[PDB]
Amino acid sequence: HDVTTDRSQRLTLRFIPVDREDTAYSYKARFTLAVGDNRVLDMASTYFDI
Amino acid sequence: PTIKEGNSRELMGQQSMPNRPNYIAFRDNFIGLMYYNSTGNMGVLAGQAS
Numbered sequence: 001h002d003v004t005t006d007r008s009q010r011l012t013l014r015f016i017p018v019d020r021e022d023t024a025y026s027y028k029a030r031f032t033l034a035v036g037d038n039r040v041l042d043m044a045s046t047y048f049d050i
Numbered sequence: 051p052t053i054k055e056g057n058s059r060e061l062m063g064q065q066s067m068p069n070r071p072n073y074i075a076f077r078d079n080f081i082g083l084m085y086y087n088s089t090g091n092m093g094v095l096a097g098q099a100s
Contacts, residue, residue: 013100014094032098033099034099036099
């Protein structure tokens with residue numbers, strides 16, 4: 001009981017950037033993501049689905 | 051009665067008759083646009099964080 005979650009939590013967050021910018025070479029996106037108030041997030045598992 | 055081009059004797063006995071009607075309209079609620087029930091093109095419709 002002193003380990004992994006028992007309450008409901010989704011493993012992944014299928015997030016979409018708010019604003020878009022396309023130009024000659026760049027494909028800019030300013031995504032506004034806040035990490036959940038208790039839960040943590042790993043950077044090696046973070047990617048982009050294009 | 052005749053295969054001949056434009057007009058020939060027996061095409062004086064020729065008759066005209068109206069076309070069958072086809073009302074290009076929409077349904078009792080016009081639903082057929084949004085994928086409400088379809089498992090493929092369904093909507094997530096979630097939050098800015100969750």
